[PDB]
Amino acid sequence: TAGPDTIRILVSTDNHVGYEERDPIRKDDSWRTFDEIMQLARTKDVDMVLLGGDLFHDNKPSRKAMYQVMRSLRKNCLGMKPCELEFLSDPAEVFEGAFPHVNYYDPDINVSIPVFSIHGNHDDPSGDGHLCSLDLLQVAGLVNYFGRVPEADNIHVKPILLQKGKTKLALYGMSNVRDERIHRTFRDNKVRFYRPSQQTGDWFNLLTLHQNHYAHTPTGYLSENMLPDFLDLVIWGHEHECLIDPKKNPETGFHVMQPGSSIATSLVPGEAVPKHIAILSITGKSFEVEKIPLRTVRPFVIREITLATDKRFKGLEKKQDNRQEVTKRLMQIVEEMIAEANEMWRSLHEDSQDDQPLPLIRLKVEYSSPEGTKFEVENPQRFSNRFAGKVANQNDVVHFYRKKT
């Protein structure tokens, strides 16, 4: 819901347009999902689109990957409708001498819904030319690429200032920098956030970044506590776990949203969390979050089984070590996962008459034998292949390992 003073912003990140392009079963999952996002922006009639990073899965995208993206952008963001937003901030900052203006302030190209985006870890600039994929879409006039970080050492963060009606919005951008280093430049107070002064209080402050939320390494993440308190809300990028619901941080005073990716780039429970995007509507200094679930997302089910401690395997396996029987018991489990995988899809698409894809099934297993009670793990490729035509991950169904090193 929105009026002339409410700004409808659509949030999404880590689309990774290019993931599993060469996979026969799951090739189009990458771009077809992204195109759904762009159609919603036109459908929900948002005022803009904000992307968090990792738009491409590859640093140097394929021609097909770049095509599908270009195709979706032109169809959904070009039109006759006028943009109700005003560009107050300095264009010269983060807009080069090629086309110093914003794309929708361009005379020869009519942009109905402007798109802003930062570069992620995969999207990041590279090569002797030092350009990223977003610069190409920007010189195409399709996208607006802000939050450039030229010097990792010395960092100045200047805002993009936009206003709709009586509502003023300060937009902060900071693309991906290697987690281990960006951890230290913050500590040394090397980063300075630039502020408008005249209407400084009224500004709703919004920031989007692309770092590890929490790290496996002790230095490879970015702690929330290091960000300024004046900020109102933060969009977390590099994380693929859909936590679109805004938690409030006590010490800092702002809320944090973690949209997660658009498709599963890894078969872990974090990627199993149902993926959404949010219709973020900003009014005055208050925001309204309307989360919207994705339909084109491939069904994904994952479970964890410790064969030794399992309720079913305890008897047959310690005594006998009968490999062929290990299958049948495991066969029954995988078939119950596929069963629920199809039901979720069935239920979710009961709603509308738009009309199913072969689901994703993952099992992770450790087996322990104290005294030659060894479970026999079949050859990884062989077990997975037997479900050819029932799952999308024909080769990658199950993982086997032991936790003693």
Place this chain on the structure above:
Amino acid sequence: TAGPDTIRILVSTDNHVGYEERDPIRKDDSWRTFDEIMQLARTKDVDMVLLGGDLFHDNKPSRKAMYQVMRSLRKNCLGMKPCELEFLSDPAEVFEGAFPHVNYYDPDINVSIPVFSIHGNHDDPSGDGHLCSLDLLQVAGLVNYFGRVPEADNIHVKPILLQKGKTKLALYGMSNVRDERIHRTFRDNKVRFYRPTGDWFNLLTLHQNHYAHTPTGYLSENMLPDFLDLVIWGHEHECLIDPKKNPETGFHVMQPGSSIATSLVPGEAVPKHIAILSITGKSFEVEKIPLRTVRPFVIREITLATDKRFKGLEKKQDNRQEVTKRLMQIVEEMIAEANEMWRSLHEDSQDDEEQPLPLIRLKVEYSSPEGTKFEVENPQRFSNRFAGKVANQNDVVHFYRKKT
């Protein structure tokens, strides 16, 4: 010169954007020259531009190469000025379901000067979607990509029909196909030219070897239909922009040549041009326009044995040491004339600057009848000694003996 019934067309080919991108001296020659082309189209106020192919030197252009092309296209081909051309042909035949219309018949993108291009050998399609670099420029709305050849075996060639005022023009296009194969499909009459009526000016653009080293690797002019009026040759880099007439066939043939030198041979040494092609009724007018941003290049061929200047010393006397100074004097006279050409050509106008370091090439076959052998010096070393005087620092001279 042109009125409402004269169609000004800018003709260019083999821009090879991406050539020597990684060369410290000559990295920018690739795109800055192509930008000159585009600015001319806006400057000369042509009605359209026609590219012969090989726009990119690489099949997968780097991000910088694609950016500089996209930049030149947006700046010169988008504007408020209307296009005086009308699209009569079927949009469906050459435009996909993505954007079935021509780029300047697009509602949300204002195109001032439309670009038509075929794909060359380097520019050719590859990969999953069978897409090339032109498909991206087309979906960006910057280029119209026509003359796709889906089947090399069976070839149907349908024309793009365009009309300005009382002047009607049928635009035929054929993308580059392998020279050895396309030679045989033509022989089997596998290719059919579709036809529209009026006295249409028929125009064809292709991207093949004019003459070949192999006996099967070229395309003879004598195989194409006779109704056509003019032909643009798009794979040959030698600049023969002057339209020769073919007696048997009855049409004229133009060979614009490349935009920069992809090879250091006398063919690429020929001063490079583009042509302001003015079509009125069934008559064409050609105004060739020389390129200023092209690097000075000088090449010569020296056969040491037969060379009159030195004879006795090099045969029977001690070699290696003295030979340098003799060759040194010659290469400096080439650098001398290279700089002069540039000076004379740029004297004309106040470009207000300094001139680029020229390209110098020497080729040497050295024969020795009877142990009279000249003593040659290591390729890298001799070339490197002109660091700062030439652009080609590590490859100035070619030494060889003919017989194998």
